[PDB]
Amino acid sequence: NPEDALLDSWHQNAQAWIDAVRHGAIESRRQVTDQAILLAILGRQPERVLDLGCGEGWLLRALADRGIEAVGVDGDRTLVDAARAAGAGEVHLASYAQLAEAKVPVGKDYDLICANFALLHQDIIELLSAMRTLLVPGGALVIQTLHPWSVADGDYQDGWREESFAGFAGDWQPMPWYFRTLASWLNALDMAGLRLVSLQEPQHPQSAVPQSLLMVAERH
Amino acid sequence: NPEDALLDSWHQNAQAWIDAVRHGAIESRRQVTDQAILLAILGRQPERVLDLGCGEGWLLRALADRGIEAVGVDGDRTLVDAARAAGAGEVHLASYAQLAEAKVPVGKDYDLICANFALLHQDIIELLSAMRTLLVPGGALVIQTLHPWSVADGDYQDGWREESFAGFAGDWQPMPWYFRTLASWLNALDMAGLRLVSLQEPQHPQSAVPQSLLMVAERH
Numbered sequence: 336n337p338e339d340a341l342l343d344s345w346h347q348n349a350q351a352w353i354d355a356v357r358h359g360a361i362e363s364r365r366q367v368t369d370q371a372i373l374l375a376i377l378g379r380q381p382e383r384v385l386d387l388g389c390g391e392g393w394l395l396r397a398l399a400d401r402g403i404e405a406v407g408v409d410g411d412r413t414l415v416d417a418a419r420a421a422g423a424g425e426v427h428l429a430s431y432a433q434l435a436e437a438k439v440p441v442g443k444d445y446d447l448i449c450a451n452f453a454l455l456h457q458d459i460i461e462l463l464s465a466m467r468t469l470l471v472p473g474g475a476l477v478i479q480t481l482h483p484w485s486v487a488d489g490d491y492q493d494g495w496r497e498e499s500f501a502g503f504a505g506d507w508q509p510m511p512w513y514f515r516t517l518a519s520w521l522n523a524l525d526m527a528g529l530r531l532v533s534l535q536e537p538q539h540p541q542s543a544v545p546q547s548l549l550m551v552a553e554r555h
Numbered sequence: 556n557p558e559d560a561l562l563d564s565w566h567q568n569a570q571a572w573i574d575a576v577r578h579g580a581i582e583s584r585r586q587v588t589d590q591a592i593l594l595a596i597l598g599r600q601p602e603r604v605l606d607l608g609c610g611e612g613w614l615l616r617a618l619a620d621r622g623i624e625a626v627g628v629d630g631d632r633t634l635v636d637a638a639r640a641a642g643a644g645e646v647h648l649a650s651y652a653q654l655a656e657a658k659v660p661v662g663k664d665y666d667l668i669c670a671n672f673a674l675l676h677q678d679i680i681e682l683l684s685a686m687r688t689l690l691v692p693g694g695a696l697v698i699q700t701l702h703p704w705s706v707a708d709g710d711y712q713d714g715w716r717e718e719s720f721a722g723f724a725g726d727w728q729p730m731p732w733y734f735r736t737l738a739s740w741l742n743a744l745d746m747a748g749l750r751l752v753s754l755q756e757p758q759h760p761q762s763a764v765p766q767s768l769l770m771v772a773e774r775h
């Protein structure tokens with residue numbers, strides 16, 4: 336099951352990930368994407384935010400620093416533990432499969448749910464539908480993801496791929512991930528009962544290609 | 556003014572265009588894009604359609620063949636004349652600048668307005684807003700355009716470009732055209748008071764890249 340292999344790669348890569356993210360090894364993040372998601376969230380003035388696939392918690396901390404109550408959830412223990420050791424906030428351990436079935440309590444009545452480069456699997460509709468249920472009326476899901484066109488690599492078609500982490504400092508195990516087209520993302524949002532209200536393509540002033548695709552979708 | 560130079564290139568290229576389109580010289584059209592726009596239109600079961608920038612009228616004819624009342628409008632006389640000589644339908648001569656200001660009567664209360672590779676200029680919001688006014692409540696604008704990612708040519712940024720028609724049979728004058736990003740298209744729709752309700756990226760089964768971007772937006 337490539338979805339189980341995906342989460343398993345995170346268990347193997349968690350430490351390398353903490354080091355990369357915190358030490359500032361990922362140029363796209365510090366130059367464009369961290370700010371892009373932060374500004375998209377702050378723009379909605381949420382009071383309660385759930386960070387889905389929060390990893391080691393950099394976004395939980397950035398939101399706490401601005402007075403926002405942020406709750407995190409992630410499926411990897413090393414990342415969850417690191418997020419908790421780095422801050423005062425609530426971080427839950429849960430897999431997406433558990434969340435899709437509402438099997439793990441992670442709070443509810445969220446103004447906003449964010450997923451920052453955290454939805455890399457194939458069957459995401461049930462998870463997204465589960466997240467909708469956790470939103471207050473008029474709440475929003477904010478997703479930042481790899482830009483489909485920038486990472487198409489000559490094959491613009493939905494399908495499994497493998498990331499070797501060749502450019503990253505540290506030692507990594509390959510990660511299987513599901514590539515999806517723009518149309519496929521928007522279909523998923525729609526099938527999950529979410530309406531796209533904003534689409535941005537964050538891009539550094541000196542870059543020729545966008546660094547990510549950032550979408551905001553509302554409950555209804 | 557690159558927008559005037561654009562329309563002027565059409566006056567020079569009109570005959571080459573008629574020949575290319577009718578003789579079946581454009582592979583993307585016969586293999587993917589003609590069907591894509593036709594099916595998107597037929598799917599909404601319109602009774603009255605305005606084809607904006609109708610050219611020589613192939614779409615007017617395809618819709619008439621299915622019992623739909625299609626009215627065309629175009630800014631070039633050679634194309635308008637050819638469209639009229641090829642069918643029983645109504646074709647109006649009008650520039651987009653005239654239409655943006657409601658200066659030329661082209662009918663109203665349209666169920667659907669379609670623009671097939673017809674919006675190649677920079678300032679399109681006023682035209683799109685004018686088109687909205689011509690829609691019945693719940694009517695739709697259907698736009699098929701070059702796929703922003705496929706034609707970015709390493710420079711994903713809004714700006715003027717020039718098409719030489721290198722791959723096309725016939726003799727052509729260069730056409731200035733405005734490249735816009737995906738985010739910029741959706742912003743334009745939004746500013747025009749139109750809501751995106753569907754996005755597709757027509758692509759031949761054996762193609763690695765999409766051939767077009769097809770969007771449907773509703774009045775409201």
Ligand SMILES: Nc1ncnc2c1ncn2[C@@H]1O[C@H](CSCC[C@H](N)C(=O)O)[C@@H](O)[C@H]1O
Pocket residue numbers: 338341342345356387388389390391393394409410411414429430431432450451452453454
């Ligand atoms: N099936 C699954 N269930 C739970 N979490 C998962 C998961 N698959 C991937 N993840 C989590 O998704 C994250 C992807 S890395 C992104 C982390 C964070 N949002 C950030 O911006 O830094 C990892 O923390 C990983 O553990």
Ligand SMILES: Nc1ncnc2c1ncn2[C@@H]1O[C@H](CSCC[C@H](N)C(=O)O)[C@@H](O)[C@H]1O
Pocket residue numbers: 558561562565576607608609610611613614629630631634649650651652670671672673674
């Ligand atoms: N400023 C302008 N005002 C009116 N028509 C314009 C225009 N700029 C371009 N056009 C028209 O836009 C068309 C682009 S070619 C596409 C034609 C047609 N929709 C088809 O699918 O075949 C031409 O017919 C051209 O005359």
